[PDB]
Swiss-Prot record, chain A:
Heterotrimer of 3 chains: alpha (C8A), beta (C8B) and gamma (C8G); the alpha and gamma chains are disulfide bonded. Component of the membrane attack complex (MAC), composed of complement C5b, C6, C7, C8A, C8B, C8G and multiple copies of the pore-forming subunit C9. It is linked to Complement component 8 deficiency, 2: A rare defect of the complement classical pathway associated with susceptibility to severe recurrent infections, predominantly by Neisseria gonorrhoeae or Neisseria meningitidis. Component of the membrane attack complex (MAC), a multiprotein complex activated by the complement cascade, which inserts into a target cell membrane and forms a pore, leading to target cell membrane rupture and cell lysis. The MAC is initiated by proteolytic cleavage of C5 into complement C5b in response to the classical, alternative, lectin and GZMK complement pathways. The complement pathways consist in a cascade of proteins that leads to phagocytosis and breakdown of pathogens and signaling that strengthens the adaptive immune system. Glycans are attached at N46. N-glycosylated; contains one or two bound glycans. Not O-glycosylated. Belongs to the complement C6/C7/C8/C9 family. This is Complement component C8 beta chain. It is found in: Secreted; Target cell membrane. The gene is C8B.
From Swiss-Prot, chain B:
Residues 21-32 have a biased composition (Basic and acidic residues). This is Complement component C7. C-, N- and O-glycosylated. O-glycosylated with core 1 or possibly core 8 glycans. Belongs to the complement C6/C7/C8/C9 family. Component of the membrane attack complex (MAC), a multiprotein complex activated by the complement cascade, which inserts into a target cell membrane and forms a pore, leading to target cell membrane rupture and cell lysis. The MAC is initiated by proteolytic cleavage of C5 into complement C5b in response to the classical, alternative, lectin and GZMK complement pathways. The complement pathways consist in a cascade of proteins that leads to phagocytosis and breakdown of pathogens and signaling that strengthens the adaptive immune system. C7 serves as a membrane anchor. Disulfide bonds join C3-C19. Residues 8-43 are annotated as: Disordered. The chain holds residues 101 to 149 of 843 of the full protein. Monomer or dimer; as a C5b-7 complex it can also form multimeric rosettes. Component of the membrane attack complex (MAC), composed of complement C5b, C6, C7, C8A, C8B, C8G and multiple copies of the pore-forming subunit C9. It is found in: Secreted; Target cell membrane. Residues 8-20 have a biased composition (Acidic residues). It comes from Homo sapiens. It is linked to Complement component 7 deficiency: A rare defect of the complement classical pathway associated with susceptibility to severe recurrent infections, predominantly by Neisseria gonorrhoeae or Neisseria meningitidis.
Length: 50, 49
């Protein structure tokens, strides 16, 4: 039977008998992580004898 | 509320079973509930939130 009104936006849906709820609980979570590392090492040595 | 044009039983709709549409009258101009009113009927868990 059913035929209770269920809507999402302007569209209307027939809920199956088995379903207690299907509901547009709408959420969004975003995560950005960026890790840049640099190291450099330089060693010049000179030795001169005359 | 029986044989009325509204599903006053919610999951069942037995009040609207075997009902002649010539005997029904328009219960209201509209059927569309407010855009997410169903969320007002959810339970809530205070610890988990």
């Amino acid at each position: 039977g059913g035929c209770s009104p269920h809507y999402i936006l302007n569209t209307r849906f027939r809920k199956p008998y088995n379903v207690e709820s299907y509901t547009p609980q709408t959420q969004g979570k975003y995560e950005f992580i960026l890790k840049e590392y640099e190291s450099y090492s330089d060693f010049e040595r000179n030795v001169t004898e005359k | 509320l029986v044989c009325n044009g509204d599903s006053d039983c919610d999951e069942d709709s037995a009040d609207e079973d075997r009902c002649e549409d010539s005997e029904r009258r328009p219960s209201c101009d509209i059927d569309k509930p407010p855009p997410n009113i169903e969320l007002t009927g959810n339970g809530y868990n205070e610890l988990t939130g």
